[PDB]
Amino acid sequence: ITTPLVHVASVEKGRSYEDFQKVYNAIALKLREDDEYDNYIGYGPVLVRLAWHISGTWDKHDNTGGSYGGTYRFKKEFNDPSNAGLQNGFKFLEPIHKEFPWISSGDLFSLGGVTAVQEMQGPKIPWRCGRVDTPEDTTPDNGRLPDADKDAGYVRTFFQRLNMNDREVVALMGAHALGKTHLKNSGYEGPWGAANNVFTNEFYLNLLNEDWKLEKNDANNEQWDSKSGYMMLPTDYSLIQDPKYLSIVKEYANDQDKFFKDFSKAFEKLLENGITFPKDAPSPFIFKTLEEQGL
Numbered sequence: 557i558t559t560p561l562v563h564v565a566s567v568e569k570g571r572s573y574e575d576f577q578k579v580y581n582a583i584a585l586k587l588r589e590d591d592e593y594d595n596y597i598g599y600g601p602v603l604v605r606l607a608w609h610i611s612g613t614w615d616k617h618d619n620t621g622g623s624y625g626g627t628y629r630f631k632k633e634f635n636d637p638s639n640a641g642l643q644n645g646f647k648f649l650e651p652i653h654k655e656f657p658w659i660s661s662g663d664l665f666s667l668g669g670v671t672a673v674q675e676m677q678g679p680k681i682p683w684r685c686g687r688v689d690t691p692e693d694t695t696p697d698n699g700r701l702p703d704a705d706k707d708a709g710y711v712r713t714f715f716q717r718l719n720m721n722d723r724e725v726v727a728l729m730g731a732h733a734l735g736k737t738h739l740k741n742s743g744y745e746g747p748w749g750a751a752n753n754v755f756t757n758e759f760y761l762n763l764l765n766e767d768w769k770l771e772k773n774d775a776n777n778e779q780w781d782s783k784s785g786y787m788m789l790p791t792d793y794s795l796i797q798d799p800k801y802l803s804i805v806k807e808y809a810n811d812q813d814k815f816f817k818d819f820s821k822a823f824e825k826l827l828e829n830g831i832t833f834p835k836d837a838p839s840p841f842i843f844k845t846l847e848e849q850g851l
């Protein structure tokens with residue numbers, strides 16, 4: 557019988573809020589310093605994509621994958637064609653992991669995404685420690701991450717495996733306001749908007765205000781390009797092709813606060829999928845930004 561395995565969270569021995577706040581600051585200080593990466597966009601978006609890819613492998617049916625084991629450090633998940641380009645985010649976190657060797661890989665990978673969102677004027681995201689590194693045999697096989705060449709029916713059915721409903725799915729997809737698609741990484745080229753390193757509801761505004769047309773890129777893939785220079789993945793554009801997705805898209809495009817709150821809950825839920833938190837485990841941490849600390 558394949559009963560769901562239980563990944564009990566174990567706080568790192570003798571570590572509290574102040575210990576993980578220093579990790580947040582080490583990540584945040586390096587974000588403002590290494591600001592020339594990828595045409596001065598910064599390492600922000602790739603750290604958000606890292607934390608999502610290390611969590612998106614989760615399977616709710618047998619509790620395999622997820623952010624608990626930090627198995628992205630192993631060669632099988634590291635060389636995922638879906639994870640192309642995430643090596644830049646890993647190398648970004650290597651000097652920080654050497655400075656804080658006590659933190660686990662899963663905790664560092666997920667906290668990197670939380671830090672990037674908050675340091676890019678995004679909402680506060682409650683974060684929790686306790687992820688424990690698991691052996692290499694626990695690394696999930698390739699193919700668990702979604703394809704960008706699909707429609708709304710695929711997006712809804714894929715995220716059901718991550719225990720995510722429609723409103724929660726539209727919220728997480730709003731993180732595509734950050735960064736761009738790299739043709740050498742995924743076969744798509746172009747950013748979604750103008751504010752590449754500022755967390756905003758711009759992803760929804762461009763989906764409704766721009767005149768999109770299906771075009772073919774240099775990688776023979778087809779994507780939706782606008783005359784302003786923005787692009788949308790077929791999975792992105794399906795958020796307005798689906799009527800249920802569309803009403804949530806218009807809701808977020810009209811209310812940035814409603815989008816920030818829904819993303820903060822959905823992103824933490826994504827980073828905590830598959831982890832059993834005991835009763836003696838501490839409450840989620842709300843990390844102060846560098847601006848709130850005067851740093």
Ligand code: HEM
Pocket residue numbers: 601602604605608640641702703704705711728729731732734735736737738739741742743744789791823
């Ligand atoms: C069906 C769901 C999704 C699909 C198919 C998808 C697909 C993609 C693809 C193909 C790229 C291009 C990466 C590159 O070429 O470098 C990308 C980038 C990105 N994705 Fe997604 N994604 C999905 C969901 C998400 C979620 C849930 C998040 C965050 C919570 C997210 C955040 C990002 C970010 C920040 C980037 C920018 C990466 C960079 O600038 O280096 N995406 N996505």
Ligand SMILES: [O-][O-]
Pocket residue numbers: 608609638701702
């Ligand atoms: O993001 O796949």
